[PDB]
Amino acid sequence: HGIRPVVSTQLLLNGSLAEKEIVIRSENLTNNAKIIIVHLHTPVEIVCTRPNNNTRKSVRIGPGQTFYATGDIIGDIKQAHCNISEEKWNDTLQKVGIELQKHF
Amino acid sequence: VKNGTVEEMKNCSFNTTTEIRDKEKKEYALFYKPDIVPLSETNNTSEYRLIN
Amino acid sequence: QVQLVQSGAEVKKPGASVKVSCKASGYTFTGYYMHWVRQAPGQGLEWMGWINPNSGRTNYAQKFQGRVTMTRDTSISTAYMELSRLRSDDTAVYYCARGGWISLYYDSSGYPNFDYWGQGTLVTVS
Amino acid sequence: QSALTQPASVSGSPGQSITISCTGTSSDVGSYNLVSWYQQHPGKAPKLMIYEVSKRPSGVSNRFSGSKSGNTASLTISGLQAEDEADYYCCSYAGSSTVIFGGGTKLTVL
Ligand SMILES: *[C@@H]1O[C@H](CO)[C@@H](O[C@@H]2O[C@H](CO)[C@@H](O[C@@H]3O[C@H](CO[C@H]4O[C@H](CO[C@H]5O[C@H](CO)[C@@H](O)[C@H](O)[C@@H]5O)[C@@H](O)[C@H](O[C@H]5O[C@H](CO)[C@@H](O)[C@H](O)[C@@H]5O)[C@@H]4O)[C@@H](O)[C@H](O[C@H]4O[C@H](CO)[C@@H](O)[C@H](O)[C@@H]4O[C@H]4O[C@H](CO)[C@@H](O)[C@H](O)[C@@H]4O[C@H]4O[C@H](CO)[C@@H](O)[C@H](O)[C@@H]4O)[C@@H]3O)[C@H](O)[C@H]2NC(C)=O)[C@H](O)[C@H]1NC(C)=O
Ligand SMILES: *[C@@H]1O[C@H](CO)[C@@H](O[C@@H]2O[C@H](CO)[C@@H](O[C@@H]3O[C@H](CO)[C@@H](O)[C@H](O)[C@@H]3O)[C@H](O)[C@H]2NC(C)=O)[C@H](O)[C@H]1NC(C)=O
Structure with missing residues (x-):
């Protein structure tokens, strides 16, 4: 099926969804050095944004090859940030906790 | 650009x-x-370099 | 409540510089932007610029960059407007207004929402 | 440099519905929903009447309204009185953190 090559470290974005319930995968639960994967059943909406309005510059670095950088910021300076819903995230964490409690 | 809680940028x-x-x-x-x-x-607060 | 107070009257010869003080009371000075506009007699409202009290970030419209400057004093909570190179047509009332809310997550500087206005500073170059 | 295009004179009568429309370029009113209407009597400071095209601030009655279509915005006043004879200004956000005001209008009551 369609495989999404999304680059992420802590979370999984735009992945597949489980059929019935959250499913926990691990090579061996006894070994703490391994990495434990949790595949969710319901997605969690996440909205990231960069409010800054950057300007694209062009500098002739070498012959016939241009270099692009940030020239100036128009308006005020703000913080780029990501938003998720607290209630849905807490419910998802509780679901993951009850799923983990089977092994513990 | 002046002081603030934002990460800010440096004009070089x-x-x-x-x-x-x-x-x-x-x-x-x-x-x-x-x-x-x-x-x-x-100690020099005006001369800098790329991380590369 | 929210109160903005400026100078009453101002007389200045052409070619000099003028300082206008806008003192705000009744609310946190670093919570909202501060806008400066100008109104000539007969003519409507001309928008000059805005200033963020927290940082030193200021923005001015066209035909005013370099000619005017905006600063602030947080200890006394007073905005300063320094205008140089006064001409014969600069005889006008300068108004100080309160802009939007500073949130640090979205740009609220450009919203034209001015709840409160000062009495205005009348600069005369007659 | 040109400001927003606004009528210079609007006349009406008491107990009538009158609309004053201000229009601008494709960058000021074409894709931004930040249009405000202020009123100003001579000799005193202005005050807000309508903000965000159709919303109403606290302290203003239900006499005023608003609209937003294409590249123009209209202030509709129903039930005019003799107190409404003053200046009306239509302000908008022109992009790049710039605020632009209208040309100016003077409401007349016959
Ligand atoms: C990712 O997530 C983050 C969060 O994690 C998101 O960031 C959030 O983004 C939203 C919007 O996207 C922001 O909402 C705005 O919040 C501001 C902040 O207002 C609060 O703080 C005020 C200041 O408090 C101080 O002063 C008061 C005294 O005034 C004092 O008591 C208090 O202790 C403190 O010292 C409060 O005054 C204000 O109270 C108001 O609201 C209460 C309900 O919350 C209400 O009960 C009160 O009675 C009072 O009405 C509030 O606590 C809001 O101000 C802002 O709402 C304004 O702006 C929207 C949009 O422009 C507009 O539709 C509203 O009508 C409102 O407009 C008023 O303010 C304008 C100035 O900004 C003014 O010009 C207007 O005329 C209007 O003024 C009205 O009231 C005055 C009297 O004050 C009256 O004279 C007028 O006629 C008129 O009636 C938004 O709701 C969040 O704040 C922000 N979160 C954070 C943490 O910053 C981010 O967006 C997310 N990212 C994405 C991509 O989604
Ligand atoms: C974020 O920054 C961009 C880049 O400055 C802003 O776009 C710019 O918007 C202004 C409108 O205020 C454009 O000015 C117009 O230029 C045309 C000629 O192209 C002129 O005929 C008009 O009279 C007006 O001066 C400017 O061209 C445009 N720049 C680019 C590269 O598109 C944008 O508005 C900013 N975001 C916000 C929300 O303001």
């Missing part, structure tokens, strides 16, 4: 080679702080 000017390869001109650009490192261990 440097000499770039123009279309003539034996001539230089002055240019400037805004760079992120993680991409900027002090050039040398000596």
Whole structure:
């Protein structure tokens, strides 16, 4: 099926969804050095944004090859940030906790 | 750009080679702080370098 | 409540510089932007610029960059407007207004929402 | 440099519905929903009447309204009185953190 090559470290974005319930995968639960994967059943909406309005510059670095950088910021300076819903995230964490409690 | 809680950017000017390869001109650009490192261990708050 | 107070009257010869003080009371000075506009007699409202009290970030409209400057004093909570190179047509009332809310997540500087206005400073170059 | 295009004179009568429309370029009113209407009597400071095209601030009655279509915005006033004879200004956000005001209008009551 369609495989999404999304680059992420802590979370999984735009992945597949489980059929019935959250499913926990691990090579061996006894070994703490391994990495434990949790595949969710319901997605969690996440909205990231960069409010800054950057300007694209062009500098002739070498012959016939241009270099692009940030020239100036128009308006005020703000913080780029990501938003998720607290209630849905807490419910998802509780679901993951009850799923983990089977092994513990 | 002035003090604030934002990560902010640094306005750095440097000499770039123009279309003539034996001539230089002055240019400037805004760079992120993680991409900027002090050039040398000596105390100098005006001279910097890329992280590369 | 929210109160903005400026100078009453101002007389200045052409070619000099003028300082206008906008003192705000009744609310946190660093919570909202501060806008400066100008109104000539007969003519409507001309928008000059805005200033963020927290940082030193200021923005001015066209035909005013370099000619005017905006600063602030947080200890006394007073905005300063320094205008140089006064001409014969600069005889006008300068008004100080309160902009949007500073949130640090979206740009609220450009919203034209001015709840409160000062009495205005009348600069005369007659 | 040109400001927003606004009528210079609007006349009406008491107990009538009158609309004053201000229009601008494709960058000021074409894709931004920040249009405000202020009123100003001579000799005193202005005050807000309508903000965000159709919303109403606290302290203003239900006499005023608003609209937003294409590249123009209209202030509709129903039930005019003799107190409404003053200046009306239509302000908008022109992009790049710039605020632009209208040309100016003077409401007349016959
Ligand atoms: C990712 O997530 C983050 C969060 O994690 C998101 O960031 C959030 O983004 C939203 C919007 O996207 C923001 O909402 C705005 O919040 C501001 C903040 O207002 C609060 O703080 C005020 C200041 O408090 C101080 O003063 C008061 C005294 O005034 C004092 O008591 C208090 O202790 C403190 O010292 C409060 O005054 C204000 O109270 C108001 O609201 C209460 C309900 O919350 C209400 O009960 C009160 O009675 C009072 O009405 C509030 O606590 C809001 O101001 C802002 O709402 C304004 O702006 C929207 C949009 O422009 C507009 O539709 C509203 O009508 C409102 O407009 C008023 O303010 C304008 C100035 O900004 C003014 O010009 C207007 O005329 C209007 O004024 C009205 O009231 C005055 C009297 O004050 C009256 O004279 C007028 O006629 C008129 O009636 C938004 O709701 C969040 O704040 C922000 N979060 C954070 C943490 O910053 C981010 O967006 C997310 N990212 C994405 C991509 O989604
Ligand atoms: C974020 O920054 C961009 C880049 O400056 C802003 O776009 C710019 O918007 C202004 C409108 O205020 C444009 O000015 C117009 O230019 C045309 C000629 O192209 C002129 O005929 C008009 O009279 C007006 O001066 C400017 O061209 C445009 N720049 C680019 C590169 O598109 C944008 O508005 C900013 N975001 C916000 C929300 O303001």
